[PDB]
């Protein structure tokens, strides 16, 4: 009986699952135990047929700790949300059952579960409740990163010395790096981008050379639009892990602005070879032929993006500004909206929603994206309007008179001033704007850029300061 | 040690996402090569073996545990060479012994051999395998793959000696059915059956036990017996897939086209990446008279999976059906270099082969298929009479080639031409006195016919010639 089932793991843990899988089915069937139930049931969904555990443990129903993790599990997989919430929660038809009550009830499981219902309650339309989980399985198992990441990602941001503390002595070690990369991470999802270099950078050298941290550092050196600083860290991940297809999505797109055609075809080629069903790979392929400019080739790539994970913003947002510039207007608003709804918080597809109505001079809603957009990211303008600048390579009073009432609109043509080789025509239009709000940083910061590009190095340094001080 | 500790239950929990990055750490704080274990463990169960191989090439994997993950990653990558020259092969080190690879891997020994024993059969080297797979089975008789291995590559070892210890329960349990599957396998089905169903009632009425049973059935060509276990095996294990191929291939058989439909809806949408599936809405659209439809889905079948054998060979009936024998030799070409011991192609090419009068060739296709499994032509014939809803010339022929003759006979016996292939049977009879096959069909015929003595008489004729 014992020796049945030690032996079984003994081929799990081996990967050996038609050896295991025929034991656990004569054990099951011998004894038929919650334990021998849970173990086949175990057995069928790390044999990668998730669909054979849900309708063994559904069939004849389970109710403990072990199955109820793994059939919840199993129905997340197959995208059985709202089931899922009801197996671990109580939640929606009985009452709720407290966090309190799930931890007596999974106990040391419940750091799992917590973070499996903080999923769903995201992917769900209710942050709200899958923060409160996230947070709180961080409290019962500080060696999760996940739902840390999950909470940055979301637009909260909790307290990295409060959230990695244990509570010889290993931990407390681990914490120490997981202190400075969690206050480095959520530093580089809100936009502090020199500040999570400066606590990245800081930290120790056999951690520095990982390729996780140097994905971040590029994508925090590519938010800056430092192309050049960034593809060096990117050329460098790739030489150090090789196996890495996690940032290799931003830096695609970094070689797509630098313009360098052979070392995007090159990591598409690597990328697609390695893994095809990853968003990345496909993200890479798909700007390597905007690259060469032939669009409908493109907007085939980016689709095996969307088909692989339909929960990846990105790949949606890059498919709309590519349907800019074939002029397809109507699919680029649906794209950027559906980036909208996996992510709420990916600022590319609220500014280019912001940028076509502009185009065609829907002002005071175009104001409202800018500003959505911008609270998320300020410095926007600068990559989203090299963008358009890439593709033209390869009403002015109307808009101002317009821009009297709101700012953004404006600050937008001006940034599409800059990004064009037209840097006189900017500082017209910006001083304009000065007088129009001496509140925003960006028009400070703006002055700063427009200064240092045409020699005045005292007259630069002067306002990015001021910016500075009127920045929060 | 709580590093460590923490990974393991964050994959026992299935979450991948927050394992590899403590295991990145881990192996960046250390380098060490339980670390680098871990984080090829981490990426591997992942789904993402690409990036356990990459790594494990790229640093320093000189151990047991080490060795094992990374032959695991190549096999998964189809890169056999690799695999091979990892457990079994030194760049330094010459052919292992078998003995030299226990050692090495002791208790992962039974596995890793295991895994070689597969490469082996892959490659051409069954002999090689088949001894790999033996020693596995003796180091760990737990292990049903490497005996179920050895029954379908055409070996016989015995049950009652090789899954012996050296747990009492399991063992005598895993006989008795071992015995069941090697009977099946060696193709004599009524004693497959009457094996396994010894069985104790509870381990009887498991899906897989039935699904032996519902095989063993098609293969007695009792398609409504073969109906009944499946059905029922349907409703303990909805969720099997494994064995309801020829299910489906049973609903074919007999014309239920209505329930080919139901049969096929749910597998489908149960599970699109099997082949099982897509064999069974193949067969499906195959009735509906929808060829085109039929074999777009025989070849998402072969698509799914191109080492899926009973794919090809359907595939091949769905183009014989549209003459489109060029097409249906490939894929019975395909299906043999797929399966070694599969009858199906072999006689589905002799049945090509005797439609082109090439009779020379269609014999020694026969003989192949006939020697895997002796009442092969039933089934085979049936088809083409389902499908379908000089006579000097093979007689001459007859003279040398006599397997040619049966299956004309078969095909006559498959129709309802009862008289006329007794006649034809007689005269091929005197050209062969001595053939149990022969003694069979006759009492095949004698069924139809009323006569109990003719049908017991040659049964029990053919079975005393060839025990």
């Keep these: 009986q014992e020796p049945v089932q030690a032996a079984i793991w003994q081929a799990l843990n081996h990967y050996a699952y038609r050896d295991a899988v025929f034991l656990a089915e004569r054990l099951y069937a011998e004894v038929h135990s919650e334990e021998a139930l849970f173990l086949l049931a175990t057995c069928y969904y790390r044999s990668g047929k998730a669909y054979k555990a849900y309708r063994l443990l559904k069939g004849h129903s389970c109710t ?83 739902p840390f990441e999950s909470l940055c990602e979301i637009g909260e941001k909790p307290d990295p010395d409060q959230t990695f503390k244990f509570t010889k002595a290993a931990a407390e070690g681990l914490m120490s790096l997981l202190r400075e990369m969690g206050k480095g991470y959520l530093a580089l999802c809100s936009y502090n981008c020199k ?3 400066n606590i990245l950078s800081h930290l120790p050298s056999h951690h520095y050379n990982t390729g996780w941290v140097l994905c971040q550092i590029g994508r925090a050196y590519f938010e800056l639009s430092e192309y050049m600083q960034a593809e060096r860290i990117f050329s460098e991940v790739r030489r150090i892990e090789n196996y890495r297809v996690e940032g290799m999505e931003i830096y695609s797109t970094t070689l797509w602005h630098l313009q360098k055609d052979v070392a995007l075809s090159v990591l598409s080629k690597d990328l697609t070879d390695m893994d095809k069903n990853s968003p990345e790979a496909w993200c890479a392929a798909g700007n390597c032929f905007s690259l060469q400019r032939e669009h409908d080739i493109a907007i085939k790539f980016f689709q095996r993006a969307i088909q692989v994970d339909p929960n990846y913003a990105y790949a949606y947002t890059l498919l709309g500004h590519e349907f800019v510039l074939t002029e397809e207007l109507d699919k680029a608003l649906a794209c950027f909206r559906n980036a909208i709804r996996v992510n709420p918080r990916h600022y590319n597809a609220w500014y280019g929603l912001g940028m076509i109505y502009y185009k065609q001079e829907k002002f005071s809603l175009a104001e409202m994206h800018f500003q959505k957009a911008l609270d998320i990211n300020p410095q926007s303008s600068v990559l989203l309007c090299h963008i358009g600048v890439v593709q033209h390579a390869l009403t002015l009073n109307k808009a101002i008179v317009i821009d009297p009432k709101n700012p953004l609109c404006k600050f937008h043509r001006a940034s599409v001033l800059f990004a064009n080789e037209k840097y006189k025509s900017a500082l017209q239009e910006l001083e304009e704007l000065k007088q129009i709000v001496p509140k925003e940083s960006l028009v400070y910061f703006l002055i700063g850029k427009v200064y240092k590009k045409l020699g005045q190095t005292h007259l630069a340094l002067m306002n990015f300061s001021w910016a500075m001080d009127l920045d929060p």
């Design 64 to 146: 403990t700790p072990q199955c109820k993790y793994l059939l919840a599990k199993c129905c997340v997989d197959l995208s059985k949300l709202a089931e899922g919430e009801q197996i671990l929660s109580g939640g929606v038809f009985n009452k709720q059952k407290s966090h309190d009550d799930i931890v007596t009830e999974f106990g040391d499981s419940a750091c799992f579960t917590l973070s499996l219902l903080g999923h769903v309650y995201c992917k769900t339309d209710r942050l709200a409740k899958g923060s409160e989980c996230y947070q709180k399985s961080l409290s019962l198992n500080p060696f999760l990163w996940s």
């Design 195 to 197: 500040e999570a270099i």
